[PDB]
Design a protein around this ligand. Structure first.
Ligand SMILES: Nc1nc2c(ncn2[C@@H]2O[C@H](COP(=O)(O)OP(=O)(O)OP(=O)(O)O)[C@@H](O)[C@H]2O)c(=O)[nH]1
Ligand SMILES: [Mg+2]
Length: 429
């Protein structure tokens, strides 16, 4: 058994962290008090003499209001007080403030509390980092944390769960700056990053769940399902993606191109009284629909470098192969010339767990497709354009420079993103 430490940074990371661990507890049969009347799950949960199952997680925010909801919440007994770290004042949507100014005053405390968790590990695999691109803390502090983690734990793999900003879901005007700034700094320290576009989850919640104006709870519960499908292989016995290393090996050919696209199916409204259960072929076909992707883009106009299929539920290997073989002769799936046109398949026999009273209906079978497509570069292009619009006038720059950051960092970060777009283009045809 090899352990995994989850790190939740800023409001987005913390709130999503809440949704994930709520789900993890439901899947493993762990009550909020920590007791488990019923190993692979020990990778995410430590055990006390009392039989309490404690999440191997760290919550960090530069202001206390978000984490305070955890300290007083349903799962207040689940986490050790040390795991919940809060500062006085936040980064004010300022990357520089979160990274340089405030980050310096709390980084040592965070690393020390993380060290506590690392000493409880017989063989730490690495870290799972949850954060937003837009927040001053989510962008600024995360990148600093990732840098220090690479120093203190060089040999440990680091995975990211990033929240891509969207105007439909409460963004600030400066969030394109923070997104580029954090991607640049974190790029060399992240082995594999799963971007989650708030616009895509917003639309999935409106389309499939019939929620006119989705809340953070609606969004996070949907995100948690995807995150759970990604980490299920680490928490259950699963011959595929058994360790953090396999994620890079199976999905990341080139170090810089470490942004796999996630696609989930099926998403059924719980209010839908009458619904027939979808077959293995039907949910597999839904993996190739842009509407079911976590990031808004067109894989039809890109090339695949890797593809992995993560099934959960009543899924027989026979039906999976029959579906894959059929899909290849009907769909337009273009792989890169230098890569094997194939699929890595993983099956978890326990069906997806859903939050009681949630918006998501219980299904017999579901699948999460992780595909490294050059089409995800569309998200970088959209983000880089917004950066260019503001940076051309040097709008809002004075705020970052005021925090100790140099003007050069902006251009340095943008040039790195420009190189990243070029890399995706070269890798196509
Ligand atoms: N999906 C999702 N996105 C969130 C959530 N909370 C915040 N966000 C997004 O995060 C971005 C703002 O960053 P925050 O995480 O709130 O800020 P922060 O990381 O706390 O940093 P500060 O600026 O110091 O408060 C916006 O684009 C929000 O849409 C959440 O619970 N779920
Ligand atoms: Mg905040």
């Amino acid at each position: 058994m090899r352990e995994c430490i989850s790190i939740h940074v800023g409001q987005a990371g913390v709130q999503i962290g809440n949704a994930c661990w709520e789900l993890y507890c439901l899947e493993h049969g762990i009550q909020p008090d920590g007791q488990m009347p019923s190993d692979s799950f020990n990778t995410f949960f430590s055990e006390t003499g009392a039989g309490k199952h404690v999440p191997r997680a760290v919550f960090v925010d530069l202001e206390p209001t978000v984490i305070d909801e955890v300290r007083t919440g349903t799962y207040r007994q689940l986490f050790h007080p040390e795991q919940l770290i809060t500062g006085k004042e936040d980064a004010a949507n300022n990357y520089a403030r979160g990274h340089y100014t405030i980050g310096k005053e709390i980084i040592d405390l965070v690393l020390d509390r993380i060290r506590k968790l690392a000493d409880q590990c017989t063989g730490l695999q690495g870290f799972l980092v949850f954060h937003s691109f837009g927040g001053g803390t989510g962008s600024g502090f995360t990148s600093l944390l990732m840098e220090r983690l690479s120093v203190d734990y060089g040999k440990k793999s680091k995975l990211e769960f990033s929240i891509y900003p969207a105007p439909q879901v409460s963004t600030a005007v400066v969030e394109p700056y923070n997104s580029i700034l954090t991607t640049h700094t974190t790029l060399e320290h992240s082995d594999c990053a799963f971007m989650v576009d708030n616009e895509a989850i917003y639309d999935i919640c409106r389309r499939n769940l019939d929620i006119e104006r989705p809340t953070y709870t609606n969004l996070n519960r949907l995100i948690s399902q995807i995150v759970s499908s990604i980490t299920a292989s680490l928490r259950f016995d699963g011959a595929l993606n058994v360790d953090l290393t396999e994620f890079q090996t199976n999905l990341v050919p080139y170090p810089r191109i470490h942004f796999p696209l996630a696609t989930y199916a099926p998403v059924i409204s719980a209010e839908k009284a009458y619904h027939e259960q979808l077959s293995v072929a039907e949910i597999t076909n839904a993996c190739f629909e842009p509407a079911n992707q976590m990031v808004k883009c067109d894989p039809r106009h890109g090339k695949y470098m890797a593809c992995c299929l993560l099934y959960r539920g009543d899924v027989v290997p026979k039906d999976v192969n029959a579906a894959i073989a059929t899909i290849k002769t009907k769909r337009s799936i273009q792989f890169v010339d230098w890569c094997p046109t194939g699929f890595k398949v993983g099956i978890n026999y326990q069906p997806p767990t859903v939050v009681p009273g949630g918006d998501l209906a219980k299904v017999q079978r579901a699948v999460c497709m992780l595909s490294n497509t050059t089409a995800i570069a569309e998200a970088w292009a959209r983000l880089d354009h917004k950066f260019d619009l503001m940076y051309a006038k040097r709008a809002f720059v004075h705020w970052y420079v005021g925090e100790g950051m140099e003007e050069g960092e902006f251009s340095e970060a943008r040039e790195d993103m420009a190189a990243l777009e070029k890399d995706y283009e070269e890798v196509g045809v």
